[PDB]
Amino acid sequence: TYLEFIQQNEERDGVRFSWNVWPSSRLEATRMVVPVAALFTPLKERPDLPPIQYEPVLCSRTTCRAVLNPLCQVDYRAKLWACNFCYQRNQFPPSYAGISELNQPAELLPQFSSIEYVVLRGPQMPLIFLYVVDTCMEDEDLQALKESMQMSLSLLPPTALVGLITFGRMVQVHELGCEGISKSYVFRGTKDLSAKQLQEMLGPSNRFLQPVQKIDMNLTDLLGELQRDPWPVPQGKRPLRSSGVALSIAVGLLECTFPNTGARIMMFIGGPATQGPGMVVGDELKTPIRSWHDIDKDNAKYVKKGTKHFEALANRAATTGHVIDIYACALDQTGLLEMKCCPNLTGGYMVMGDSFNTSLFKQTFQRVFTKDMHGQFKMGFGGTLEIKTSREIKISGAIGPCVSLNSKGPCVSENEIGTGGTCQWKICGLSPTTTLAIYFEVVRGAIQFVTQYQHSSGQRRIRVTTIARNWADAQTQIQNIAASFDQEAAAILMARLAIYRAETEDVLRWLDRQLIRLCQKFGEYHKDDPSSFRFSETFSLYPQFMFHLRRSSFLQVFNNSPDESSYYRHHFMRQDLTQSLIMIQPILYAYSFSGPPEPVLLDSSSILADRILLMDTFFQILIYHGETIAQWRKSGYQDMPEYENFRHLLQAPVDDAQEILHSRFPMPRYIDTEHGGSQARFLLSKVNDVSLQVFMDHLKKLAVSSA
Amino acid sequence: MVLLTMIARVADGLPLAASMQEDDLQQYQSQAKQLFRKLNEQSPTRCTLEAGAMTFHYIIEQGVCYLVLCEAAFPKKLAFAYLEDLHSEFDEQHGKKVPTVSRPYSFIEFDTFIQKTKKLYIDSRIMVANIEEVL
Amino acid sequence: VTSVV
Amino acid sequence: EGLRVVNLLQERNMLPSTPLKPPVPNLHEDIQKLNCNPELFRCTLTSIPQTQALLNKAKLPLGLLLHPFKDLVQLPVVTSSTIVRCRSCRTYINPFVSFLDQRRWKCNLCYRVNDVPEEEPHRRPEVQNATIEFMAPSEYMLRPPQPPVYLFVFDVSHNAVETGYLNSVCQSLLDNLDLLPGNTRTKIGFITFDSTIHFYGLQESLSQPQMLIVSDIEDVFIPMPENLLVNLNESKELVQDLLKTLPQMFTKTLETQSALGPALQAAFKLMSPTGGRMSVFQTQLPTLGVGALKPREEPNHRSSAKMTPSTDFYKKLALDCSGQQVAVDLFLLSGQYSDLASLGCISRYSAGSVYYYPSYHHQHNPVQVQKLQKELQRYLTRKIGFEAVMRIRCTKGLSIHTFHGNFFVRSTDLLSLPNVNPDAGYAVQMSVEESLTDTQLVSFQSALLYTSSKGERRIRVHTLCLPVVSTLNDVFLGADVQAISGLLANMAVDRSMTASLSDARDALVNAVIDSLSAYRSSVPGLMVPFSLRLFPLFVLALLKQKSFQTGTNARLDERIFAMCQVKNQPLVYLMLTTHPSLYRVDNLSDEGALNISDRTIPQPPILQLSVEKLSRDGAFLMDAGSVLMLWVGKNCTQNFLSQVLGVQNYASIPQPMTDLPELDTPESARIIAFISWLREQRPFFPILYVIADESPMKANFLQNMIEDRTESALSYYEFLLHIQQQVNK
Ligand SMILES: [Zn+2]
Ligand SMILES: [Zn+2]
């Protein structure tokens, strides 16, 4: 079963290809409508593989150096193995002299196509956490932020290093643990500093980065005593908030102290940057923060200059190997658009809300520090992804949270896509859900993913995934290829390409031309007869995924603020397939007396009066009460013991909502609305050129017409 | 915004208490002393005077004038509420000693209450005339 | 600077 | 008295055994009984020469020395609704005006007739007191009276931490926190600095003070708007906790460089909005940032007279402080060269004062430890005036042309005094611009407008009246030898900076030559008038003082600090330092001022400063003003050792002896009575050390024997012989 094949391969290898049978010829490789690409999850969790405390065995060929994998032909009599990439024959290392057929190494068993090694040779480096705290916010917001930071401090490993940087009009770098005084280095938030300058001005641990077990008591007291920025805010003015200099001072601090080691720069902002490099809006309250409409008419003089400042900090932190998180809570826009490259280039998180004093932010912030079945954070640091392919395969590029290492080889393709021109990428921060998208090109086929990263325990680890897909038989080329089409993976991989072009500017024109092309090659139709058009079960859902994608908030940036568009795209560019489909096409469940909860179509015809709907959009959990149920619930029938069945109906969507309102890392916003309610708009906009029915008729007309 | 504050006996313009922090001041402290000289028993008890980019506000209670200067963009509603807080406190503490003192600034130590009241207004967290006509 | 002293 | 002529070669014992009293101006009995106290205001020539030509013939400098803010026994305070002043030259009505129509008074400085306001007018206190204080009205102030603001700036480099000065300074502040002049408006702040600049925030809402490090040395700023300069009354507990914590913060410091300049720039910005007193404590050469100073090699006894500031940074900064009513006091506790010749400018031009503690160390130098403690006690508790201007007026025809002291001379001879302290002395040189043929009396009036520590504008006015004479003899008969010596020392200091030390020394010798040669050409030996019988003695003492001495092992900062004292101390302490009083104190007896109720107070005779007047069989006390040194002879009597020193033999007198014991012997009671009497006559507590033993390698006691010859200077007799050779050349 091809579905069982796709399911078991993502469970084992954390990968999903657009095509599982690849073009064996050059004539069919160029003619592929959707490129051969892979949704790859390097640190995907699975039912307990034993970590292999072995140095990975390598092909003794200079260029290749691939890892011993189940595709290698072995010879247990002659103690030799042949590399499946370069055909080199290798001798086994001394520690493998005793291997036999009835007791062979794990990396050769097919169940271990994806496997993790532990490299224990150097002394382990402590983790590093740098708090960068805005003080230009209301007391209730700041007090809640202080408590959230104090809570996170009680979760950190005893050996991890911590430092504190607070900012407002000035930037303060706190020297922790000084006794009886508590000193800090104050800098103007008006000019930037380089790492070198900051090192000379400031003069394994530091004065500024101390181990938790040595400093957790003093830091807890310091975080407790943090107060507002002492500088008054005159009437009709915004506070002077030097976000750009504070972030650059945090980046420069770690750059000259612990370069090339896992560190987390966690920045908490309560508003936009109003002073200094990186400025997003002026200090005049009469001037609103720029909107998307303000962007398209050149009425935003801070955007391009502010974006450039944070792109320089993003590449600085990513070259050094450090992570940048942005936790932004305010009632107005905060500038995520200009700062998005810091958590995007690094593997950092982007959390946005209305206020730090909510369950939404507090619960989202503590899920950052979720541990696994050993008390260890689900974080990885300094991830180096290296992809080794067969000679017939070349890597076009990657789209996702990563940076290029600019390493060359015969696996690099001239056609670069996203972050291309390399067979190596650095991912400063990965989680078990981090999902990259690697686009390939043809010029059993094999590809090997080698991800070296620093575990939250400090252990150096190497995850090796080796997959193989069949070359299409020449006598049944396009038929075997058509049967191996992953319509869900291809939609997300094409969506990744579409979002990347809009965010680096029409994109809908490219998305339509490929949908129509895919219909003509893999559909069934008589010429100039739209009603004759059919799609096999393999392709039937692709147009619907394409309909919701082109109308989504990922490509229709208006009706949202620029910060919201950058937040939505940020999380889509990192998620696996399952969550990505939910973003593009929210799932809808229906609740009524006439049966158990059932999934229903995202169309206005699903909005019934005697039904409760639960819509999950990934960012939102929405419960809609129909007009009949709304009146029944406004009446008071629930409290009466006669209608305990009406209690089940009102609590059934709430219960199902609670479960997913805990696993999701960016905790979704919860909405309890009904017919006539204001918040019912979110359901009416995701639901229903115009409608899907009209959209399909237009597609069939063009598919059966010109090529 | 920012300002200057003065308390003076209306009869002779004798200064009673003030408060000034620069880091100009000379042109508007002079204009303030002109007003104190002009004010008498027939002057309006509550007034606002326009000084271009700056704006004076005063009240007169018990022969004592409470004057404040601020940039023209400071809320007129808050300028008079600041003068009432000073007047109620000053009249309570020294209201009965005012018509007897003869030294200038016989209540310098009222500086303390002024600046602590002042900081509760320049932090968001009746009549109108021209000062140049009156002078 | 000028003074009355 | 004495119109008699004196031959200095046959006397040689000219120094009187009793203290020198200032000359009485030859005025009418009723005019003189109102004259200003000569400790506050005195002239080099009590008989003013009528013309400039007569003044030039006398070859003596004409000038005034004044101590205007001196602590007084009684001060008449006039609170009049109007200050009566002359309509033309703004002279305050004073006892030396002329009433004619009884409703009209004639100004004694410009002769303009004025009208007396409806407010026996000659019985008014303004006409009965030469020294008086006025309450100033609103026209005498540019802004509301400023509060008291005390900012303390401490060097915390590695050298400074090693000296341990920070401990006693913080302890003195704690002990004297309630004695700081001021009321509830008093503000206080603190800054430490090394290679960076450290502020200190003090809020009752926080567990502990906050140290805010400004590291941008090229671009200093104020890190916090509030809570750096805090109200002392409210935040008393917060200030006290900081003074107890500061000495413990920099114990293991490795910072060796000091950015004094940028720290003073930051301290200036912090005090700019209000003004006040800045107390700077520095221990080494500034070597980092603006105001850095190059090292210099110290001179030895071998280098000739081959002084000035190395930069104008601290002079410019001092002028910026003066404009914002900020005075800067400098405490230099350096063990090596620190270029005081450049650092002193921060205090000269801001009306501050400098204090020098050479080789200060908490363990190794106990004398400087106690000297700093006593000077800090006076410095923190004495009265203070803020944002002060002083004007000095004199009768038409007389013109001040050169000012001396710590201030900034504004246009039209206004003296800007960001602070005024009761221990400061000033000097002025004048000339006869128009012949005084009209009058027979001329007056001099100093007016000090200032803000008291209670926020009250006040004017202190002193008026001096002197007669005018027209003969050379009358000029000489009225000469004040001490005042002339003081003015010449201030002129020789300026000559050192302007020309050289050689020219300064020569002009001091030439002033004695030219004065007595002019006296000679208007009458065998060396003939001087009675009033100038000590003129060569005091000038010789001036030339052997640390300010002008030559062939000594004196170091750069020592000499500059000696000149800073010449420019800043009152006349009496310049005389006490230059020519200390020497007494024999092992044989005291009660012919003393035994009048003071229950105390006897011996009055031993003053001795001439020569080793010939000493004796190995006794003990001698030297009052140098700021210090008392009790030298004990090697063959001293057993009575003095056991009954005064509390010691059984000369060998067991402790090497550094910080003071005498108060034993239960009548000999001890006599010497404690005599020392207590000396100290009550001044306010900076002079430390007494008896450590001057024949072998304590600290017998610089002998350096004050200014009459004896040395390997690099003349004796008093040799000096007299050189004067006579040049007088009749
Ligand atoms: Zn190989
Ligand atoms: Zn006159």
Residue numbers in the entry:
A (entry chain A): 3 to 205, 225 to 464, 476 to 537, 541 to 723, 746 to 764
B (entry chain C): 1 to 23, 29 to 130, 148 to 157
C (entry chain D): 7 to 11
D (entry chain B): 346 to 464, 476 to 662, 666 to 882, 888 to 1093
Give the article text.
The packaging of cargo transmembrane proteins into COPII-coated vesicles entails a direct interaction between COPII protein and cytoplasmically-oriented ER export signals. About a half dozen export signals have been identified to date, almost all comprising short peptide motifs, all of them binding to the Sec24 subunit of the COPII inner coat. The ΦC export signal was identified in studies of p24-family and ERGIC-53 proteins, and comprises a C-terminal signature of a pair of hydrophobic residues or a single terminal valine residue. The ΦC motif contacts a site on Sec24a that is also the binding site for the LxxLE- and DxE-class export motifs.
A series of ΦC-signal peptides was synthesized, based on a core sequence of yeast Emp24p, and individual peptides were soaked at high concentrations into two crystal forms of human COPII protein: one comprising Sec23a/Sec24a•Sec22b, the other Sec24c. For all ΦC sequences, we observed clear evidence for peptide binding to a site on Sec24a in the Sec23a/Sec24a•Sec22b crystals, based on the presence of residual electron density that matches the peptide sequence (this binding site is occluded in the Sec24c crystals). (C) Residual (Fo-Fc) electron density (2.6 Å resolution, 2.6 σ contour) for a bound ΦC peptide containing the terminal Val-Val motif of human p24β1. Thus, specific recognition of the ΦC motif involves the terminal carboxylate group bonding to Arg750 and Arg752 of Sec24a, with the penultimate hydrophobic residue of the motif nestling against Tyr496, and the terminal hydrophobic residue fitting to a pocket of hydrophobic side chains.
